[PDB]
Design a protein around this nucleic acid. Structure first.
Ligand code: AMP
Ligand code: ZN
Length: 177
DNA sequence: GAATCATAAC
């Protein structure tokens, strides 16, 4: 509600933090990345929330998507890593920001069940699905009951086995390399 | 003992 909530804004203004910059968006590395590659794609024109998304933003949304992919190719093309581009249903930090994150989930910043389910349940809306939603309906359909998904038991995104803890989940992920 | 959770953060 003060200063920390503005961090994203601050870091997007910071030239050192800008991995990519153009007339519409700026892309920065996630300060507490939940994987080996984790970038945030932010529009210069602030947008409050996914509930306030219209057709006007469609050309911007596609652009953010495209830009994410560029960064993924430009800085992680050599990696044989699978990526995902999408948004959190409920952001914590102010503004809407696109997540581009590698599916290894090998990062010490991933510490609790909230993180894992925020990237591995319907709480994480894919960018393509969002874009199609604004194209088809002119608005994003966000199913109710998102905060309950954050409490769901740990399930691996590759093998699909249920796991009991963040430490055992990390060790289980290690073997998928 | 270790992991998770709830909550405050001056
Ligand atoms: N100063 C910062 N610079 C860059 N990324 C940040 C900063 N502070 C927080 N973040 C990231 O912003 C994300 C929040 O996005 P969201 O979950 O969409 O609300 C988290 O993954 C944080 O790690
Ligand atoms: Zn697995």
């Amino acid at each position: 509600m003060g200063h920390w909530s503005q961090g994203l804004k601050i870091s997007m203004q910071d030239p050192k933090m800008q991995v990519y910059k153009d007339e519409q968006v700026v892309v920065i590395k996630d300060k507490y990345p939940k994987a080996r590659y984790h970038w945030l794609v932010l529009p210069w024109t602030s947008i409050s929330s996914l509930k306030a998304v219209a057709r006007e933003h469609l050309e911007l949304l596609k652009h953010m998507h495209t830009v994410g992919e560029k960064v993924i190719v430009d800085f992680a093309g050599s990696s044989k890593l699978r990526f995902r581009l999408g948004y959190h249903a409920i952001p914590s930090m102010s503004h809407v920001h696109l997540h581009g994150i590698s599916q290894d989930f090998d990062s010490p910043c991933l510490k609790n069940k909230k993180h894992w389910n925020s990237f591995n349940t319907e709480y994480f809306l894919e960018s393509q699905a969002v874009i199609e939603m604004v194209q088809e309906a002119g608005r994003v359909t966000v199913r109710d009951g998102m905060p309950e998904l954050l409490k769901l038991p740990l399930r691996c995104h590759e093998c699909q086995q249920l796991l009991p803890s963040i430490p055992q989940l990390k060790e289980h992920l290690r073997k998928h390399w």
